[PDB]
Amino acid sequence: AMRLPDGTLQVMVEARARAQVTDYIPGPYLRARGEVFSEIFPIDEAVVRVLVEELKEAFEKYVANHKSLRLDRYQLEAVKGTSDPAMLADTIAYHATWTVAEKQEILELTDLEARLKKVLGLLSRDLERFELDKRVAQRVKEQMD
Amino acid sequence: AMRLPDGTLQVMVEARARAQVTDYIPGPYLRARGEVFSEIFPIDEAVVRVLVEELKEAFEKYVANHKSLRLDRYQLEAVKGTSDPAMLADTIAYHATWTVAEKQEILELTDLEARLKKVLGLLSRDLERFELDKRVAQRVKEQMDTNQRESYLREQMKAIQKELGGEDGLSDLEALRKKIEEVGMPEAVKTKALKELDRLERMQQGSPEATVARTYLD
């Protein structure tokens, strides 16, 4: 517990659980309920862990293509052993660079059914943008000669 | 008989067999006396047992597809543990919930083969529908990935139309082509306009084919 009265505040947070906004109480100070501090668990966890593993493989093929706007895997590979699939989806979504609003919509979503297909969906378009960058780069390479 | 508090009155019973109705005094309730036992053991009980085990496997896979919805496996233990098919077909037909009229049709009939085949076909059709719905959902997800890929390549096409040539004129071409799309083309007209549309994407001055393509697609 250490807060700053000025500048960029250096406070360490830990996302114990995902939640949503229901109580529309206008702020400041805005008072909206969260959820229980237990991690939200998937409903099809045998299929969900395979979906998270192919999410890992999609971002793993992406990061070689992502190298123009490359982000790390060191926070991702430090948490790959965690049994919670939602936070793996959130970390893959953060480390694969796209819209920060879309990243926050992914991460603050409680359900894993929309979250995992959203992260795989944006890993589809990133892979495809950087593979179009690959084919246009080799197009540049052939076109200059 | 126990009184569990839920607002619903229930009594624990253990039925033996079906019976006929001879008194039809209107009620409620009805003072009808049941007849003799009418449930009969089917001929060739080995084939009946094979059909009960096949429907047991079908019901196991039916709850196993509902395990995607985190449904626990307790009705399978209810329909297992007994070796006589007479209670087995009855508890499988109970744990497969259907309409009250079809359950009355089950109660009227004493043979077991027709209800076993009917419940097996219905459960198989349900599994096909649920798996088809999941595949449609994932395919629609990948389709909107393809569409958002076509979009993002279009605003990188438009983002490079900024800083280059003339954004005036070319933004006129993009709003123009939105006017072109939003007037309601016939589909052959629209598709053969789409090549002309992506050819109007040429920059108007340096590629003056697009300049007459304005005066064509307008």
| Contact (Cβ atoms closer than 8 angstroms) between residue B52 and residue B60 | no
Q: Identify all chain A residues contacting B153, using CB atoms and an 8 Å cutoff.
A: 129, 132
Closest CA to A64 of A111, A131, A109: A131
Would you call B94 an interface residue with chain A, using a CB distance cutoff of 8 Å? no
Q: Does A111 touch chain B (CB under 8 A)?
A: no
Q: Terminus-to-terminus CA distance in chain B, angstroms?
A: 82
The tally of CA atoms less than 13 A away on the side-chain side of residue B21 is 8
DSSP state of B42: P
HSE on the CB side for B193, CA within 13 Å? 18
Distance between CA atoms of A10 and A8, rounded to whole angstroms?
A: 6
Q: What is the DSSP letter of A23?
A: -
Count Cα neighbours of A45 within 13 Å in the Cβ-side half-sphere.
10
Q: Are B142 and A124 in contact (CB under 8 A)?
A: yes
Neighboring chain B residues of A44 at a CB cutoff of 8 Å: 67-70
Torsion of CA A24, A27, A29, A35, to 10 degrees: 20
- Quote the DSSP letter at residue B34: B
Tell me how close the Cα of A58 comes to any Cα of chain B, in angstroms: 14
State how far the Cα of B86 lies from the Cα of B40, in Å rounded to an integer.
9
Q: How far apart are CA A60 and CA A52, in angstroms?
A: 12
CA pseudo-torsion sign A59, A65, A71, A77 = positive
- Among A107, A90, A81, smallest CA distance to A55 is for A90
Task: Give bridge partners of residue B34 from the DSSP assignment.
Answer: B21
- Does the distance separating the beta carbons of A125 and B68 come in below 8 Å? no
What residues of chain B lie within 8 A of the CB of A116, using their CB? none
Residues paired with residue B21 on neighbouring β-strands, in sequence order: B34
Contact A103, A73 (CB under 8 A): no
Q: Contact, B199 vs B177, CB < 8 A?
A: no
**Torsion angle defined by CA atoms of residues B2, B5, B6 and B10, in that order, rounded to the nearest 10 degrees:** 20
As a whole number of angstroms, the distance between CA B87 and CA B156 comes to 68
A21, A26, A29, A30 alpha-carbon torsion, rounded to 10°: 0
Q: Which of A43, A44, A121 sits opposite B141 (nearest CB)?
A: A121
| Cα–Cα dist B3/A132, whole Å | 69
Rounded-to-integer distance, Cα A40 and Cα A37, Å: 9
**What is the C-alpha to C-alpha distance for residues B104 and B93, in angstroms, rounded to an integer?**
12
Q: What residue of B is the nearest CA neighbor of A44?
A: B68
Tell me which long-range contacts A30-37 makes (C-beta under 8 A, separation of at least 24). Answer: A35/A110
Structure-token pair, residue B218: 């307008």
Rounded to whole angstroms, the maximal C-alpha distance in chain B is 98
Note whether B153 and A132 are within 8 A (CB): yes
Which uninterrupted H or E stretch holds B18? none
* Residue A49 · residue A85 · CB < 8 Å: yes
Q: Distance (Å, rounded) from C-alpha B22 to C-alpha B35?
A: 8
- Is the distance from CB of A117 to CB of B141 less than 8 angstroms? yes
- Tokens 């009265």 belong to residue: A5
Rg (CA), chain B: 34
Tokens of B171: 């933004």
b/e map B164-185, b = 16+ CB within 10 Å: eeeeebbeebbebbeebeeeee
Q: Which of A98, A115, A99 is nearest to A107 (CA)?
A: A115
Taking the C-alpha atoms of residue A73 and residue A95, their distance in angstroms, rounded to an integer, is: 7
Q: Where are the beta strands (DSSP E) in chain B?
A: none
Nearest CA among A110, A98, A84 for reference residue A21? A110
Residue partners of B105: CB distance under 8 A and separation at least 6: none
Neighbours of A129 (CB within 10 A): 20
CA B179, B181, B185 angle in degrees (round to 5)?
120
Segments in A97-111 forming alpha helices (H):
100-108
For A132, which of B67, B144, B153 is closest by C-beta distance? B153
CB pairs A-B closer than 8 Å: 33
Distances (CA, A) of A82 to A79, A115, B171: 5, 17, 49
Q: What residues contact B214, with CB distance under 8 A and at least 6 apart?
A: B173, B176, B200, B204
Q: Helix, strand or coil for residue A115? A: helix
DSSP state of B68: G
For A27-71, give the DSSP string: SSSP------SSPPPPSSHHHHHHHHHHHHHHHHHHHHHGGGS--
Q: Count Cα atoms within 13 angstroms, Cβ side, for A98.
A: 30
Contact (CB<8Å) B68/A43 = yes
How far is CA B46 from each of CA A118, B49, B53, rounded to the nearest angstrom? 51, 5, 11
Query: Got the DSSP string for chain B?
Result: ----SSS-------------B-----SSS----B-S----PPSSHHHHHHHHHHHHHHHHHHHHHHGGGT----HHHHSSS---HHHHHHHHHHHS---HHHHHHHHH---SHHHHHHHHHHHHHHHHHHHHHHHHHHHHHHHHHHHHHHHHHHHHHHHTTTTSS-HHHHHHHHHHHHHHHHS---HHHHHHHHHHHHHTTS-TTTSTHHHHHHHHH-
Q: Is the peptide bond before B24 cis (omega within 30 degrees of 0)?
A: no
Cβ within 8 Å of B, A 118-137:
120-122, 124-125, 128-129, 132
- Give long-range contacts, CB 8 A cutoff, 24+ apart: B41-45: B41/B86, B42/B111, B42/B112, B42/B113, B45/B85
The C-alpha atoms of residue A23 and residue A33 are separated, in whole angstroms, by: 6
CA separation for the pair B73, A59 (Å, rounded):
36
Q: Which residues of B touch A128 (CB under 8 A)?
A: 145, 149
Number of H helices, E strands in chain A: 5, 0
Whether residue B149 lies within 8 A of chain A, CB to CB, comes out as: yes
